[PDB]
Amino acid sequence: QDINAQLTTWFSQRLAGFSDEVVVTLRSSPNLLPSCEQPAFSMTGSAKLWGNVNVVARCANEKRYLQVNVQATGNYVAVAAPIARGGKLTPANVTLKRGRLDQLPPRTVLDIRQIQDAVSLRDLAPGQPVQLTMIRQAWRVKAGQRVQVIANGEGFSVNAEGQAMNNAAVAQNARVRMTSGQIVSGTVDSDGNILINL
């Protein structure tokens, strides 16, 4: 049962800020588990946060692939009052509701800061989870603008300047041409700054 406890803790920590209740269950055979007592878990795979995922369990040069099931409960953005097509999304129209993140439809908005100055693409009814496929977010960053790039690491932080190379909404990927001429890539935050996680 200790392996589930490790995964539950590893995922709870990874899902900090998103979920307040995480439960993880191993699907692959425990015989295929690596020799170490505490394997190092790495998500060197696609960007899927929860559900049924593949976790790399490293055991000092010994590599293993574990199939796991991640259940997550937290906040997401839901429609609170009917929104007309072309209608703006506001705090009076949408609200945060608590539910199972793993059960939500794809590309569901979790943070209210994402839908600043956003318009509906279709008719929306109360209770419906806000999906990115059903809205048009305003650009937080515009191509050609100078932006601040903030890179954080373990005991290591970098602040630098560049020019945005593409239009991007809050929480979307932004490519930035640094003064040195180099291209970097990060996530647009609410403040319009570019965050790079190293």
Residue numbers in the entry: 1 to 198
The authors write:
FlgA is a periplasmic flagellar protein that chaperones P-ring formation. FlgA possesses a typical signal sequence at its N-terminus, recognized by the Sec-dependent pathway, suggesting that FlgA functions as a P-ring assembly chaperone in the periplasm.
Atomic models were built from amino acid residues Q1 through L198 (numbering corresponds to the mature protein) for the open and closed forms and refined at resolutions of 1.95 Å and 2.3 Å, respectively. The conformation of FlgA is different in the two forms. By studying the 3D structures of FlgA, we identified a pair of residues, R113 and S190, which are within a suitable distance for cross-linking with a disulfide bond that keeps the structure of FlgA in the closed conformation. To understand how the conformational difference between the open and closed forms of FlgA is related to its function, a disulfide bond was engineered by replacing these residues with cysteines (R113C and S190C, respectively). These results indicate that the closed form of FlgA can bind to FlgI, but cannot proceed with subsequent steps, thereby inhibiting FlgI from forming the P-ring. The closed form of FlgA is reminiscent of the PapD structure, an immunoglobulin-like periplasmic chaperone for P pilus biogenesis.
